[PDB]
Design a protein around this ligand. Sequence first.
Ligand SMILES: [Ca+2]
Ligand SMILES: [Ca+2]
Ligand SMILES: [Ca+2]
Ligand SMILES: [Ca+2]
Ligand SMILES: [Ca+2]
Ligand SMILES: [Ca+2]
Ligand SMILES: [Ca+2]
Ligand SMILES: [Zn+2]
Ligand SMILES: [Zn+2]
Ligand SMILES: [Zn+2]
Ligand SMILES: [Zn+2]
Ligand SMILES: [Zn+2]
Ligand SMILES: [Zn+2]
Lengths: 398, 402, 405
Amino acid sequence: KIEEGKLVIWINGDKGYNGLAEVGKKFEKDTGIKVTVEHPDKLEEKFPQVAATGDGPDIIFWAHDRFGGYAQSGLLAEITPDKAFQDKLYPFTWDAVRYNGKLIAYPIAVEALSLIYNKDLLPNPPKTWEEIPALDKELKAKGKSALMFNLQEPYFTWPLIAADGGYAFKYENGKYDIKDVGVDNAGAKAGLTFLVDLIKNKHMNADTDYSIAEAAFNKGETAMTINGPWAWSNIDTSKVNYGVTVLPTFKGQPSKPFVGVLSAGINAASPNKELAKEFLENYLLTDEGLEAVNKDKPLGAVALKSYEEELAKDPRIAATMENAQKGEIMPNIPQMSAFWYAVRTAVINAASGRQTVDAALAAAQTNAAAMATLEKLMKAFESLKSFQQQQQQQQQQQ
Amino acid sequence: KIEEGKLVIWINGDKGYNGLAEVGKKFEKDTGIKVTVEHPDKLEEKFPQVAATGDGPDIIFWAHDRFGGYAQSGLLAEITPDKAFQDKLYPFTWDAVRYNGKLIAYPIAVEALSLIYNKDLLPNPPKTWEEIPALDKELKAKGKSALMFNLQEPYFTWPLIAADGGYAFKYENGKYDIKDVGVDNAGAKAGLTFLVDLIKNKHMNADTDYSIAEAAFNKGETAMTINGPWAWSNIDTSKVNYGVTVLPTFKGQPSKPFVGVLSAGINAASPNKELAKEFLENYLLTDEGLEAVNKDKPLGAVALKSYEEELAKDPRIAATMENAQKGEIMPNIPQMSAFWYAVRTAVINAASGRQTVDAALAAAQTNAAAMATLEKLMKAFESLKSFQQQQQQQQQQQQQQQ
Amino acid sequence: KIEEGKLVIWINGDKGYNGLAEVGKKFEKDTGIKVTVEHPDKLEEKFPQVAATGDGPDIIFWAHDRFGGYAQSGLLAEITPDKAFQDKLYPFTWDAVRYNGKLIAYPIAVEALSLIYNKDLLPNPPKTWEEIPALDKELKAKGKSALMFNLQEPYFTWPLIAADGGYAFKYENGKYDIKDVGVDNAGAKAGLTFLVDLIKNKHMNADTDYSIAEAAFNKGETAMTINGPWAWSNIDTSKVNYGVTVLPTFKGQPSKPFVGVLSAGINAASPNKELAKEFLENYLLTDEGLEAVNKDKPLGAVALKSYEEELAKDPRIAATMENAQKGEIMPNIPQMSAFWYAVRTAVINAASGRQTVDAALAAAQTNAAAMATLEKLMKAFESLKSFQQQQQQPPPPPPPPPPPQ
Ligand SMILES: [Ca+2]
Ligand SMILES: [Ca+2]
Ligand SMILES: [Ca+2]
Ligand SMILES: [Ca+2]
Ligand SMILES: [Ca+2]
Ligand SMILES: [Ca+2]
Ligand SMILES: [Ca+2]
Ligand SMILES: [Zn+2]
Ligand SMILES: [Zn+2]
Ligand SMILES: [Zn+2]
Ligand SMILES: [Zn+2]
Ligand SMILES: [Zn+2]
Ligand SMILES: [Zn+2]
């Protein structure tokens, strides 16, 4: 009992859900359909629980990375946008929303790391990573630092590593070639070498965690930090005059940051599949649909070109999109979670001086793809196999 | 002990074993060799203990699915029958007895599921699945039911799931590309959807096992049941005037039931190779040779064309063969055992309503890839504590080198 | 040590480290870089500890067989021998020091099983295995056996099993198709069948290890035995007129022993790679270079052509090179560990007569492909989850494998 001639939608309670209900209210006045917008506890964990029984929302708004886990479990139905509508958003986005070579959701917003500098002590930010050794020495004169960011998290260091040539998995025609990890090619090796070199030369530091990093920019002790939109709402509080632009280029090559995409899919057992697709087609994905959601909580850079250009005037949005346009979509696959853990145990050891670059990266590849399925096959089996035998005889033992 | 120079034969019991002694009589005359037949108990597991060591029977009659594991263990010897002899049997029975491109057994009899109907309620049975709902209410008025067959089983339900396009492991070129299941494509979805509908719309029950099915048709409480030749004798004793025909077609596509070709194979450690392949190729696989066994215990439809027509006059056999022709040759690989438990839980979840079609169904592919691996890792685990444990320290090394 | 501006070399306490050291003070004078030659304990284990951290020697001398885990763990650096230098060595040795298509070391010495025969009991040695039966009866009368070698080992039996057409994996350009395990084809069957036939035929015993075969030869109880260069020294002390020649041919085809190649690899962390390459190229590996090492302690067959044709004068050396050119460059991949164990139990079973040739040979490769992931993957995450999450002998893992009922 998901619905019956109405649209109940799910979206995280920190989003522009009030602006969405306004789009649902304008939708109601136009067709005659009651559009409930909800925002329950850890929905992304509770959704695959009820949607498996055939219940819950008609539509669910979430970042694409968590969608592959639904799209595989047959919880999302395939969408069907005509080519006329497919051109309205962006070429790179659609690619973030296909599972098994077929579109599984409508992309809403976008999320990419950008370079945040202090215009007061640094009015013209660097175009490359190569003057940062030059810039830190100059900054050390006034008791300041050129760069200070979280090295304890792979997502933050990945823009540099993947800048020259490195890549997580090889995306081939809407079908990631899983057996093609790229944390070994000279590009990934030269990248991480540079990162550790800055730690060695003392142009940077090692124990910089997110707590320290963000709070080192708000007091104005550093010239630059790399961080995504979620940080903007803290630089305003700190008064600090802040500029946002494209990341610096390494070896002349543009940096590759991982790009998430807030997207909305349609439930597999949601009878109102037409209305759900109807609401999303020309009520939310229209200029206003987003303008209305944007007012409640700004969603950064949007998927829709037409409204993306209207929002482009804002430099921060303008740069986030430019960073996203040369970035790699964070793979929506299940082995992605093992990659992160592998690359994390790499960069921690590489920076610490436990393993020389070339060794820890080549180790990551061996204990990434191989330790990806090892537990997967085992856990996924020992969970379902025991569960199967646990639930079966207990059903008759009730 | 080495199997002996005579042709020693093993065979379960249910089949016409005394019928082989009559074939051994035509064989003891021309070539003059004593053809014994042992009827062992639980031999489907006692074979890789005697034939593994170099003993066991020269020949073994058994369903082809079990022959994969025998074949893979190197216990069975490859055969090469005449190209003209191969055309003596149905081309589809040949693909049943192959491993990695190599023929490893002689096909005897086929066996597929078929529609069984009570002539005194359905004088003309439906060719279409879609008419099951309409026929149910028409019979419910008389206090009856349209169809009733086992649901706690993938063997019986699969025919419908597979009907549209759903398959186990893909067969391409005398092999199985295992990394290519098909319990999730549109076909497999459309099928199980339809089956779950008859359950929720009350045209059909959910908790129906085999016991309730077979009996209800014998008691005349249903007008159709899906079953094989193993229940023919029971409906003979029920005194119920029953028919039998080709399975109902879903979505204009023929329903595909799992096949089961009974076959004989010559084991590797059986030096009496030529005799076996002589006796089997000619003496048993003659027009008359099959009569002999069939006369003891009926074999159902047979792989041999010429003799097939002879029995095909009985519609019961003609439809078993017509349904085998258009079905899945039950793959003889190790991963197949997993396919069962995964669909087993998939179909029971879909029927009880606790999950849904696409939901419980997409799980089966994840369960198929997850169950197969550990089973194909646990049989080495048992071997590591029996070859690197028992062979390394229990026996010889402690029994002589202590 | 980390070095920086110098050259620290690890070899092995028993090889011609002195001869290498003389090349050390030779190179030292020509450039200005003092070369140190050290011989640590169990260095084959020590290297992947200290090298992984950016310490250890600049170059390492070891059998390419273990260089696979070094090249894979990213500890060794890629080399670049010019086209002219490539041709200077025996073509087949270059295949020994390749990883994922890349060269990861310089080959030095070659070591392959040979055929050692007593000249007194048997002047002209048999060139075929099919003659072993008839030769055995001939010697049985005089109270002697024709051949006795190690049977509780696949490194000694394999040469025959593979002689017909079998192999470990598949090398067809510069890679291994690991899903190819060829211990099952007619070759292996016909091979092992012959060997097992000999045991049942009583032409040879079943409970023969190394120590027995080495002793029975040296005492002159047997005519022939299969053994590498390492056993020569003991036959020298036994004063038994021995000769070494090519292995007996089976079914017309040459026999096939696994080839080992001593190699000199350069650490990835070495700041002075240029010196390491210049020392290993233009010094040690030119006639005189090896001439030094060989004099402190013999090397056997050598990767270099010029100095080989001069060493080959010794019949035994030219017979190791003959055997090696027909041998099977032993794979350095991590799967090789399981393969050995697999064949070990396959032969121990076939010899004892428990299972048929066809069974033991099919059951070998299934136990091998299952074993390849049972430990190389299981013990790989087992220790990773143990540490990165945390807060000779297989010793099997957990967890709970509940089946049925
Ligand atoms: Ca349109
Ligand atoms: Ca608000
Ligand atoms: Ca007749
Ligand atoms: Ca077909
Ligand atoms: Ca030292
Ligand atoms: Ca000089
Ligand atoms: Ca040159
Ligand atoms: Zn909420
Ligand atoms: Zn500096
Ligand atoms: Zn407007
Ligand atoms: Zn109905
Ligand atoms: Zn020493
Ligand atoms: Zn003999």
